[PDB]
Amino acid sequence: ARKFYVDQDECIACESCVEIAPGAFAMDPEIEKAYVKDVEGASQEEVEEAMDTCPVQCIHWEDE
Amino acid sequence: ARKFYVDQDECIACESCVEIAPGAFAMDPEIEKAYVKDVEGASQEEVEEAMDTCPVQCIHWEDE
Ligand code: SF4
Ligand code: SF4
């Protein structure tokens, strides 16, 4: 799967990514930021949907 | 994009598919059989892991 990750510094905890892609994203109960729980847990189009929806655009691809 | 479903007549409720791909599979608590809750809820490779692991080979691609 092309790699992706949440930049948790920026994350506003809206939960939209955990709603769109629940096999790939989860909330960390004690820092209140979202993180990738599985890079293979959503198809590439569902990942993109969650990335394009992020209000603060903090989920990034890492090709680099 | 992908179409795959569980043939619930054969499903023995082992839960390996909802363990491997939780964003794509869920247990229907009523009949205790697995079904696809979101066809984009796992990458193609993660869906294959679940299909190949299925003990009764009851998860199929549409057109098989
Ligand atoms: S969609 Fe963006 S801001 Fe919202 S919880 Fe997910 S990573 Fe954080
Ligand atoms: S892995 Fe196969 S038998 Fe096991 S719960 Fe899923 S569909 Fe049913």
UniProtKB/Swiss-Prot annotation, chains A, B:
GO MF annotation, one: electron transfer activity
Cofactor names: [4Fe-4S] cluster
Amino acids binding [4Fe-4S] cluster: C11, C14, C17, C54
Pfam families hit by this protein: Fer4_13
Keywords carried by this UniProt record: 4Fe-4S, Electron transport, Iron, Iron-sulfur, Metal-binding, Transport
PANTHER family, alphabetized: FERREDOXIN
Protein name: Ferredoxin-1
Species of the source: Desulfocurvibacter africanus (Desulfovibrio africanus)
